[PDB]
Amino acid sequence: AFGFLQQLLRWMDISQEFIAHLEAVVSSGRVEKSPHEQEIKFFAKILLPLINQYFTNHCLYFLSTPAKVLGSGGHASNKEKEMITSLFCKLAALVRHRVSLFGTDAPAVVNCLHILARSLDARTVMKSGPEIVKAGLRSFFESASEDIEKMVENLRLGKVSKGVGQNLTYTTVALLPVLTTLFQHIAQHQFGDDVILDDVQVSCYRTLCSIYSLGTTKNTYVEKLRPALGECLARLAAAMPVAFLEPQLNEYNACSVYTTKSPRERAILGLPNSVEEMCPDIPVLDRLMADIGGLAESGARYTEMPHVIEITLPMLCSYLPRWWERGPEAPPPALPAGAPPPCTAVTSDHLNSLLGNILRIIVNNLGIDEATWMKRLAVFA
Amino acid sequence: GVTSEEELHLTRKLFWGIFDSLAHKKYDQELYRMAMPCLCAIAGALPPD
Fold first, then answer.
1. Of all helices (H) and strands (E), which one includes residue A308?
2. Chain B residues inside the 8 Å CB shell of A76
3. Which member of A46, A62, A76 has the closest CB to residue B36?
4. Which of A147, A231, B20, B42 is surrounded by the fewest CB atoms within 10 Å?
5. What is the Cα–Cα distance from A342 to A349, expressed in whole angstroms?
């Protein structure tokens, strides 16, 4: 695996060499010689299917650790975990804003990104890893946040919807499905408290800030993008180590930038000086629950609340279960570690209240002719 | 039974022999169509470690 991964990384710098040539010729100086035609075909037709199947079979080998072995036997070394992380980052940057240049090979690239994401032991890499490898993973989240911010501001009809077309097709086809898979992978393996710590949190906050900002937007593009945005936001909530819906209790959360970093810092990098101001347009948990309850009892149909059903509800359906285990009413093994008060106030009442509202929402739209959101809501609840 | 540490050596050479040769062969659709499954099968048999 070490030699196989090293060759794959060797082809990654080769891949970056001819895509720039393709970008150059597609911009100026058209020429169909294609000096790297052999390299392009080998990368697309051999490497991508090989990466797709190799890491599908040996997914448990790379996710295994000496503390906890998942596969039949053996576990990847730290260097192997570092290389597979750099492979994901280089491949993601390769396809960034170049989905069209891959032609029919773009579905192959994103499928490799999905499988590489499911085989990322990011806990070990971020804890004990080289700065270069860690900086690559941080740059991926930062780049993802910037692309989503450009996407949402274009969905705000700042542009009719140049680079707007490239950014829009890259995010909805490559960035969003991959980011959803990566967050789901982090949530399943409890990597949130180890990966999203200092600058990933800032990147994840901006992604959380921007995605929810579609509530005050009414367009045709936004209507078809809600299922993708909602699923991505739900996975982010499961992996987010901070209770962004309960900023009043953030002082008791160890995995927060406002506790890990000094007040002297957090000013060299732009931060709003208060946890409540990170995403101020997100209603607090108490407010959010009241709004859903009011809509459910009012008998409102799906047409007058598409944002809540497609985005807000999946967020709460994933936020509450995560923080029910870390707050009051949890089954606490906290005889030694019970001194810090819980950073959340989620109890079984919140989950019970939300479930009752969801059931009332469904029956309000029980007899309508078309509702494709019911199947998506069922799996989230 | 299990491999005898010599079949794995043959399998490892078989993988890199095809991989290196295919990396320099000019693109042939027929060759690539059946060489790729061979590499995937070989890679899926060798232990990663």
1. none
2. 48-49
3. A46
4. B20
5. 17
Euclidean distance between the first and final Cα of chain B, in Å?
19
CB contact (8 A) between residue B43 and residue A54: yes
Burial state string for A172-195 with b = 16 or more CB within 10 A and e = fewer than 16: bbbbbbbbbbbbbbbbebebbbbb
CA–chain centroid gap for A327, Å, is: 24
Q: Is A251 left (phi over 0), alpha (psi -120 to 50) or beta?
A: alpha
Selected for mutation to probe chain B from A58, A79, A112 (highest B CB count within 10 Å) is A58
User: Count of CB contacts below 8 A, A vs B?
Assistant: 47
In whole angstroms, how large is the CA radius of gyration of chain B? 12
Enumerate residues 1 to 49 of chain B having a beta carbon within 8 A of any beta carbon in chain A.
19, 22-24, 26-27, 32, 35-36, 39-40, 43-44, 47-49
Q: How many residues does chain A have?
A: 381
In sequence order, the 6+-apart residues with CB closer than 8 A to the CB of A193 are: A241, A255
Token pair listed for A367: 């007899």
Which residue in A161, A163, A134, A135 sits closest to A147, CA to CA? A163
A63 touches chain B (CB under 8 A): no
- CA-based nearest residue to A192, from A232, A230, A235: A235
B25: left (phi over 0), alpha (psi -120 to 50) or beta: beta
> What would the DSSP string read from start to end of A311-333?
IIHHHHHHHHHHHHSSSTTS---
Angle, alpha carbons A267-A269-A273 (nearest 5°): 40
Per the CB < 8 A criterion, the answer to whether A126 and A134 are in contact is: yes
Say if the Cβ atoms of A53 and B44 lie within 8 Å.
Answer: yes
Q: What does this entry list as its resolution, in Å? A: 2.5
CA angle at residue B34 from B30 to B39, to 5 degrees?
140
Contact B36 A41 (CB under 8 A): no
Q: Which residue has the tokens 């950014």?
A: A167
Q: How far is residue A125's CA from residue A84's CA, in Å, rounded to a whole number?
A: 10
CA–CA separation, A179 and B22 (whole Å): 33
Contact list in A for residue B32 (CB cut-off 8 A) is 41, 45-46
Structure tokens at A321: 């279960």
